[PDB]
């Protein structure tokens, strides 16, 4: 369940993969792990599927209610604090989830929330079982002066390097790009395949 999200100068790039497996047996080869919860905000879930989808519905409804009755979008730190309180009220009967929240209000932010409720902002983050391989790739090639195209190439390279050594990850790659000018944009499948072909990878 490899997830990744990096920041740039006025852009957030968040990418996942798609394989649902809870055995040594592959149930589904095409799942959803990357969601849109506001106009300029996304969220990647990784962990237990049911609890993840319930948290997704609860966050989408409450963000939409706040946006309608205040006529402004909710800030990203307020989103992370609200979700931290929601996870930490039930810390003894917990949720088995591990999720990321990224967005743009005046500057790009990425928050990383664990199953007890601790949210820590960092530049780049990665959750899942392929997270050490993703942190190994991003430790040696990430730079703050990169452009949007180089970032899209980097997250594809990182997930495609995590797919080779982790048995629980695989499939096509979702990529979404968040910008203040263009909003939440999810890149098409043929464009992702063109990226993979021009880099020199398989599947």
């Amino acid at each position: 369940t490899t997830t990744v999200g990096i920041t740039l100068k006025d852009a957030v790039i968040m990418a996942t993969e798609r394989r649902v497996t809870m055995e040594n047996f592959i149930m589904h080869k095409n799942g959803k792990k990357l969601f849109q919860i506001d106009t300029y905000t996304g969220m990647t879930i990784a962990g237990l599927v049911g609890d993840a989808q319930v948290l997704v519905r609860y966050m989408k409804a409450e963000l939409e209610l706040y946006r309608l009755q205040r006529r402004v979008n909710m800030p990203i730190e307020a989103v992370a604090t609200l979700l931290s309180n929601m996870l930490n009220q039930v810390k003894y009967m917990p949720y088995m989830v591990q999720l990321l929240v990224g967005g743009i209000d005046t500057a790009p932010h990425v928050f990383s929330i664990d199953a007890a409720g601790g949210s820590v902002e960092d530049i780049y983050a990665s959750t899942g079982s392929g997270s050490p391989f993703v942190y190994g790739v991003l430790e040696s090639q990430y730079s703050e002066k990169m452009t949007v195209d180089e970032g899209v190439d980097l997250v594809i390279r990182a997930i495609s390097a995590a797919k080779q050594r982790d048995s629980a990850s695989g499939g096509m790659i979702d990529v979404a790009v968040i910008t203040r000018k263009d909003g939440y944009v999810q890149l098409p499948t043929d464009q992702i395949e063109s990226r993979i072909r021009k880099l020199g990878l398989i599947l």
Binding site: R57, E62, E64, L65, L68, Q69
Partner: protein, 227 residues
């Protein structure tokens, strides 16, 4: 001697307190709306007030969702409480079924809430009427919800002090499936013929939706065309 309690019938069999709520609705300004070829609109009269008031908070039309919206008339406090309850019930429906599938059960929640207070002592009813309108899985919708909880789906209506005159005009002039502009101008004439003599129609807030799109509120200069 019987118009003092919400729970007592007259020897005719009327509920005078329920009807006095219907008299309290009548003191609010006129607001109309109707459906057309792929969508529904809403028109609301506003006698323009003090320029110190921020115009964002005198809008009788309010967006409950990106796909449902409504307008009120009557007591302003009860009106605000009701549009809040409509928003919260829309969110609960959307989370239990995945989406706002039908507008009718949102209107049902609001209707049962308004109906319950017309039965028990120690509570007064809401003196507000609401006109819901939007797009669902079926298509364009248009309701009205009165103080007693009675809901009815229409093709054209009004509420407020002018209601009888506007529905009298629409009862003899309205023809369905007009393209959006012609529909709006027919509704403007409907709003015009409800005023009293000497009164000039000021600028009314008007908004609409079409099948496959979200709302938009015509700003005051797009409104200004149809004066």
């Amino acid at each position: 001697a019987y118009d003092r309690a919400i729970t007592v019938f007259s020897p005719d069999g009327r509920l005078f307190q329920v009807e006095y709520a219907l008299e309290a609705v009548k003191k609010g300004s006129t607001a109309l709306g109707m459906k057309f070829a792929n969508g529904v609109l809403l028109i609301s009269d506003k006698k323009v007030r003090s320029r110190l008031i921020e115009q964002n908070s005198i809008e009788k039309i309010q967006l409950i969702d990106d796909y449902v919206a409504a307008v009120t008339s009557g007591l302003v406090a009860d009106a605000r409480v009701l549009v809040d309850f409509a928003r919260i019930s829309a969110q609960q429906e959307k989370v239990t079924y995945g989406s706002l599938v039908n507008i009718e059960n949102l209107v049902k929640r609001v209707a049962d809430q308004m109906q319950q207070y017309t039965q028990y002592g120690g509570v007064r009813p809401y003196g507000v009427s609401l006109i819901f309108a939007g797009i669902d899985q079926i298509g364009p919708r248009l309701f009205d919800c009165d103080p007693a909880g009675t809901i009815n789906e229409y093709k054209a209506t009004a509420i407020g002090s002018g209601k009888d005159a506007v529905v009298s005009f629409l009862e003899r002039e309205y023809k369905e499936n007009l393209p959006e502009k012609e529909a709006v101008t027919l509704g403007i004439k409907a709003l015009k013929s409800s005023l009293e003599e000497g009164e000039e129609l000021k600028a009314p807030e008007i908004a609409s939706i079409t099948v496959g799109n979200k709302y938009r509120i015509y700003d005051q200069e797009e409104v200004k065309k149809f004066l």
